[PDB]
Amino acid sequence: FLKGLPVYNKSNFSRFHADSVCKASNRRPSVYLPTREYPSEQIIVTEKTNILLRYLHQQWDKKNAAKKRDQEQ
Amino acid sequence: SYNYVVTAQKPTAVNGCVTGHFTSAEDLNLLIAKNTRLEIYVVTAEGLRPVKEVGMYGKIAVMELFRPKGESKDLLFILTAKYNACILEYKQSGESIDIITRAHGNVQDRIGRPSETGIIGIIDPECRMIGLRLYDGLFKVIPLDRDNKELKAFNIRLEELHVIDVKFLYGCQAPTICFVYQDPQGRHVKTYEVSLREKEFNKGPWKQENVEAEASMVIAVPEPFGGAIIIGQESITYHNGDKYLAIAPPIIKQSTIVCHNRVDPNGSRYLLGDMEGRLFMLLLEKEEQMDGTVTLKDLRVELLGETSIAECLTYLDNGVVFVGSRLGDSQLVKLNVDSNEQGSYVVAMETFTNLGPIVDMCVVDLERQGQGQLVTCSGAFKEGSLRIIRNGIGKLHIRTVPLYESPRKICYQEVSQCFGVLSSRIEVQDTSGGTTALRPSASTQALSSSVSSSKLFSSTSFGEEVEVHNLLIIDQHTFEVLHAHQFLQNEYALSLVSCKLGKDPNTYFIVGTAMVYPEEAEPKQGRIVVFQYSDGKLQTVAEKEVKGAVYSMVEFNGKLLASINSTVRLYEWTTEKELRTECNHYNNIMALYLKTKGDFILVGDLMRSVLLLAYKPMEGNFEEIARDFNPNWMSAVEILDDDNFLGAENAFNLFVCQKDSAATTDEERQHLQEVGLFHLGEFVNVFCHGSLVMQNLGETSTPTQGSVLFGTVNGMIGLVTSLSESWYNLLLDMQNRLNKVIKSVGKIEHSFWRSFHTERKTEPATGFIDGDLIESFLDISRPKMQEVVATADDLIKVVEELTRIH
Amino acid sequence: RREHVLKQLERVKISGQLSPRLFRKLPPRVCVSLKNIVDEDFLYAGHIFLGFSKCGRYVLSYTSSSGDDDFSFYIYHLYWWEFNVHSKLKLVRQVRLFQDEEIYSDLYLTVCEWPSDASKVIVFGFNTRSANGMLMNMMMMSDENHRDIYVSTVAVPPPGRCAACQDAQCLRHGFMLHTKYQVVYPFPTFQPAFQLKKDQVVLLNTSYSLVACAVSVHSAGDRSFCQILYYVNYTKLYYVLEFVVTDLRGRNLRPMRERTAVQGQYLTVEQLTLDFEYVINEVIRHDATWGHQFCSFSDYDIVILEVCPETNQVLINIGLLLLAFPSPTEEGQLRPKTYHTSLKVAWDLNTGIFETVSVGDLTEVKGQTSGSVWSSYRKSCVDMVMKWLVPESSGRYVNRMTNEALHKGCSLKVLADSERYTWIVL
Amino acid sequence: GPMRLYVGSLHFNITEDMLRGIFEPFGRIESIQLMMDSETGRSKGYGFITFSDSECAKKALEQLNGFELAGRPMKVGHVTE
Ligand SMILES: NS(=O)(=O)c1ccc(S(=O)(=O)Nc2cccc3c(Cl)c[nH]c23)cc1
């Protein structure tokens, strides 16, 4: 049948309930208010070179390396 | 002008839901994106255990969990609407909970226009890269490698300039993107291999395939099956090289599939959510081969039942599914093997409050006077409701009145002790000729009912969805629908007002309508209808034919002020009980919003910012006083005071423009200088003068003057109060000093987040104070309250005096 | 299948998604006839309406007064009019373009706006051919080998307020820069989207060089300076109120030429020039694989391929007609043949340095027309630009205004303000 | 001028300035008429180029008719009015 649904832990939702008719505006998660500063391993940076300029530069380097094939086959 | 913007109710709509092992390798987490807020939960025996709420300085546009090689547990990638990108790690040293910013940086390009189907962020199954679709004709690649101190992102030109959806495929040697694109020939599917070495696209593993015209979603089926599922309006298709399967189930044709969820890790079962709220199960029939490989034998869809209209579906565990909703309440549902008496396999376990979208609201002293209560028009379609909100001593208290149809406008009539609510219901035409209601609603279950017997417009399609507009008369105590007045066939009720006009001692319900015929897409005719609700019965008093759509209506010194398309028109109420045109203003584009204060009128245009009109009682005509010459697409307007006006714009910013005080010439007096700019991050639909706090009855000189409540699409309720130049200068230095101590997840500068931003300009925040950052001072530790430099160390005299509102 | 406006407006309230891009398939909200918003009707001068400003506040127009004095010298004026939906247009600025200029033939003039810099507009004007040094009864007669280019930068009316320092009307940013140069065959292409991709800068192709011209105004705040150049020619000049020859003026006549030390409002005129022949020779000498075979070059044609305002890089293509010895292979005598090629060069506006991006192979002309060669080379540039096309943000585009009503190309039908969905029907 | 030419089957992004750049090398142009769609503000993919000398126009027609521009084969022919 359509049901033989994933079980990550049989205990999950086995003791669940709040038992109320269509109502729960509970913002139970405590807000995270950071004070401690921890360094970053990396900084995400965008490549400044234009896509056309990048392509024309590498395509010319492909053509040049193909010409440096000299002194036999 | 100087203002204080504070949150009374945080956004309640669910914009995105994701699962994984973020807090621990063994913990099964549920991560909810509520606009700017990230809610972390652990799935336990009791249900969802709350962890922490992360307040990002940005609208969460991309939220995906991923695990690179060697990593202890999953990492979270977040991309904001302002293009701030970050990789986050959860750290817990016993009791101390901390979120580490692994990598941060802005990925915005000066070139490139944002795409129609908005920011898409995908992560490669082998975690070789992150792929971003922000702009048309560009694909951003973020290589994932811990070895280098920088993550050097690069753009690859995408020939297909109109991409609908994109996914990274599983079981691939090189990272591979599968996408649906539109062009004059229609919609098609395409694949490309991503080369990190060459920084380009290589020929796709499988050729271009012509897909359905309304093909909207791409599903990447995991490693066993491989390939991609495409969902359209009329069909579901599977694609993996020469392998192809297409199904046309007539059931899915009725409503658009908008979300999907992989149930099985192998990809055998998928949950599919409808615009109607219907829940489906997509079944992928397995085909085990002698080679050790697996293929797809068949595709089958089964209707499971009904849920809230889902934005995101998320299987959690043991048949329990999270239904993330933005047009209604969110839910926890149970998938049972056995179906009930109705024939449904789905059973609701819990309901979570969502006030959004708030389309209209009003402030009323319902139960006891002086204590204000908000009465909103919430949700849409079957999720449509009224929400009664109040600051209840013994924080916020919400009462839900389900309507099972779209609430549009709300007004209160104290003399009648009731609410006048505009509602719309969807009706589908059958083989009978007449349209039938899908489900019972507030307009069909009313105690007494009436139909519009108007003959003014003296001179349909099967399956086509039509809107049936009604004026509902709702009791203020029971919230029962006392009366339902059905407007004309194809008539749309747009505006609503409750007032006394001229010398008439009777209070009326006035409705501005528009005729919406299937033949023409433009509103060329409407009506202004005057109704009176007496001892149980509602009667039609008068009707005035207009040459367009009645967008807004405001009572104006005993007269009826209405906006008909591009015209702003003033009406008088004659002794013959008829409406007579006094004056007109024609210099508008789409006059959608109107507000009044004395002889002054604030005109909000949908495309051409805001305009100030003054009615001259001696001349009996309008005068254009000033204009905000700045280009703004407006969502809502408000009059703060005689010379200051508040505006809400389409790029989720707030602005305040004022009459020029240093203006010498008549031309300079006609210019409204913008003196207040702030990035709210919410789309404001309604502004209201009011408070949820008791009048006075024991009160002290407030640091702020005025009180403007506002309702947004995300269900967020906020306050705008005007501050003194002395209070502003104090809190401005405080705001900047608090930013040096209060850290930011993803290393996004607060000043950047709050800056006025549009596709045309980016200017810093001015004349506005972020009330949520100022109020966070009460939650930090005593040794970290060191933001004060000349004495008065106990700054709890202020801040706590500021929390007194809301 | 077009949807009802009211269904779309209903969708905005529940989605929070409102944009001009979303409403692009919607018809104009308001259409005004020019006749109903124009004053002094019946035959109100020679006003050729060009269109709306990017901000949608001004409607621009121009006049071409021939002046039948037999000899006939053209006078050009540019007008700014305030638009107010159904109300009549109000003139806010009347300016004279190319002062003291002997315009012998009717110029094709185009008014352009910068991507984000709204403080000034640029007016390009060109004749079909240059006026000769002769006369043939009926008219002056043209020079088939030359063409004149007139370039004028005019300040836009202030949005209102400040600099009440009148001292009698006239103001502070009521400046005018105007220049004139001659071009030879193959007459350089007009590329306003690229020539103005960088704010406050105009790139000019004078057949022999590419001139980057930056015009900027500064107050006596030492916070900002030099956009062009943080070796080939660079000239910086200063001007206060009260190589391409540029004569500055106020809204009517000449300002005082000043040097650095001046404390008050000052204008800067910068010119970075790139010599084509020096570039061509330097590319052949250092990067062309066939540089040994090269003898000389007959002619060249420069087309801009891309302008990157963030990295201050200008990508240009150089179409080259040259004479070269054929490959060392002996099939008889090796007489030099005429070949066509193309060199791609990236010019850094910050350093002034140029870098070789691509060197094309030598293609034999084989008795082709010079015109056939340039036409084919320019089709190859259009092909490249179209192929690498990436749509841009609105309000970053170059507003190009034209109305060739007098140039046998006939008058415009509609002047549109797309962001406000407003049409002026002529 | 002796010869008016119909230029058709153009890509909608091709501007009047591009058409001038592509046809001008053959000789003097009296007028260019790129046809614009009033409702969109974009090209109709066709126009009229009038040369001052018929021989310049005939050579332009020979070298440009049937050949691709932005992947679209250009259509060039003689036209009266
Ligand atoms: N719509 S577009 O393709 O993005 C586009 C459209 C116009 C421009 S232009 O204004 O810079 N002109 C332009 C560019 C390239 C070649 C030529 C020739 Cl030859 C004459 N004018 C050219 C750039 C890009």
From TrEMBL, chain D:
Residues 3-81 form the RRM domain. It is found in: Nucleus speckle. This is Uncharacterized protein DKFZp781I1140.
